[PDB]
Amino acid sequence: KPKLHYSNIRGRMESIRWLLAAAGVEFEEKFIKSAEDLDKLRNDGYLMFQQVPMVEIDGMKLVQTRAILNYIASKYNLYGKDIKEKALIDMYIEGIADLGEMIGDLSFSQPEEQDAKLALIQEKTKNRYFPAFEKVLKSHGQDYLVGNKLSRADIHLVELLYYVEELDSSLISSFPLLKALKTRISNLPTVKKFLQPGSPRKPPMDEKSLEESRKIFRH
Amino acid sequence: KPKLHYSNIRGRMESIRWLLAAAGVEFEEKFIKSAEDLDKLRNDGYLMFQQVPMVEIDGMKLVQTRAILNYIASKYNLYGKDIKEKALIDMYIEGIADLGEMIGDLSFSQPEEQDAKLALIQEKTKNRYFPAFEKVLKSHGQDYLVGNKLSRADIHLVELLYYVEELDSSLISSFPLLKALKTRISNLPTVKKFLQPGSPRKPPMDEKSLEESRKIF
Ligand SMILES: N[C@H](CCC(=O)N[C@@H](CS)C(=O)NCC(=O)O)C(=O)O
Ligand SMILES: N[C@H](CCC(=O)N[C@@H](CS)C(=O)NCC(=O)O)C(=O)O
Numbered sequence: 001k002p003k004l005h006y007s008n009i010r011g012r013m014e015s016i017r018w019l020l021a022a023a024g025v026e027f028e029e030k031f032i033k034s035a036e037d038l039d040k041l042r043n044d045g046y047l048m049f050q051q052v053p054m055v056e057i058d059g060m061k062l063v064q065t066r067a068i069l070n071y072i073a074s075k076y077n078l079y080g081k082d083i084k085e086k087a088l089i090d091m092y093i094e095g096i097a098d099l100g101e102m103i104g105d106l107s108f109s110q111p112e113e114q115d116a117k118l119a120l121i122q123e124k125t126k127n128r129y130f131p132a133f134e135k136v137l138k139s140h141g142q143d144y145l146v147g148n149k150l151s152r153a154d155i156h157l158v159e160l161l162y163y164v165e166e167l168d169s170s171l172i173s174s175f176p177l178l179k180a181l182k183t184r185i186s187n188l189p190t191v192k193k194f195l196q197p198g199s200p201r202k203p204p205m206d207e208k209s210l211e212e213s214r215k216i217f218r219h
Numbered sequence: 220k221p222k223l224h225y226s227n228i229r230g231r232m233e234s235i236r237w238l239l240a241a242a243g244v245e246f247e248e249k250f251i252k253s254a255e256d257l258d259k260l261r262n263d264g265y266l267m268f269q270q271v272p273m274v275e276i277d278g279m280k281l282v283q284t285r286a287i288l289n290y291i292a293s294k295y296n297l298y299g300k301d302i303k304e305k306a307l308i309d310m311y312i313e314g315i316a317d318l319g320e321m322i323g324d325l326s327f328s329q330p331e332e333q334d335a336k337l338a339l340i341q342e343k344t345k346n347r348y349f350p351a352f353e354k355v356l357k358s359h360g361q362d363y364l365v366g367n368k369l370s371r372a373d374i375h376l377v378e379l380l381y382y383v384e385e386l387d388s389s390l391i392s393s394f395p396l397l398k399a400l401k402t403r404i405s406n407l408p409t410v411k412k413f414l415q416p417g418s419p420r421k422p423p424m425d426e427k428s429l430e431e432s433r434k435i436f
Binding site: 048049050058060062063064065066067068070071074075083084086087090091094095098128129132 | 267268269277279281282283284285286289290293294302303305306307309310313314317347348351
């Protein structure tokens, strides 16, 4: 079992939880609970950069979200089949990560700044990100983003579709190919099990977890 | 000659400018001088997500800084031999990237925030990132970060080592291994010409260029 080091939150670890489940890979989680547990990881020398997420896979203590995601995607052929298909997967997913940063930020902002920032997410979703991904899908009518075969870009885009619906159900309403991508992926046996109740998938940020985060990562 | 679309600043284009010259590749730069030079790009449908950098390469109009670098690095075999070397290169370069964001964030701030934002970079440089990259060289004593060969990881770190030096010259002083990597990578024939005067290598952010920035985007 590769091992997942992080607090018990979506956070930066969540996109790795998604990818491994979609690859059929059982993993293990070791939840940081205090700044002390975290300090322990640093002092043991497990964290190259004194930060989490960290994943122990195949001999390595991997840090940096992208590095972990890259490795797992190549290991299970979810990173395309040539240098050109990587180009498209990387374009799409860096696009996906960008809308992600805004979404995480909002869940960590104060009540005061929350309206302005969601209005900015709503705006960029409908006008910038969703049309672009809808366009890709139409250009070829194929069931996946790249090479007509399951990749990470599909896993990551559908992860993001679930956050948008938590923020505003009608942002996907004029985008029918994303509507049906959302559907099909969700139904691939590995993503179905991951989506079902009691899986390792994490709920939205709420005040008590925000507290915990504040005190664990002493920021 | 693939074609770089960005303004006449470092920004997110610079790590791409550095990697290409280090690899030998001559490239074009078509500069964005105005809010409508960019508006144009969007309108022609050049920018997947309405943004730049964008690099016309091998038939693709590539956006996203990480997608562009990833491609260039693979094409020119600076991305490791196998999947496993890749993960070491990836962990490494993303670490360089986080202190990268700190240094760019500083350059776009007004002085009212700078003093402080610098104090943070210094603290993180000496106690976090520099020690991390020393420990990797010390452990293998080899001339490059990964696989006993030049990879993009050596390239990014040396670039970053160079901005640190503009900002506080003595941060690197207790790190004779990086101190040493800096010299070697810089005397590499390709990296030597890019470091020469007159190259496509970009000058530090200043007000003039900041005025342009606020104004184009
Ligand atoms: N480049 C990021 C950095 C990760 C990061 O900043 N991790 C946070 C938790 S969300 C952390 O460990 N904070 C503790 C610290 O920086 O000292 C990544 O994708 O892993
Ligand atoms: N994902 C980044 C995003 C690029 C980005 O935000 N670029 C700015 C210039 S530094 C831009 O084009 N801003 C216009 C906008 O987002 O509307 C990348 O690596 O390309």
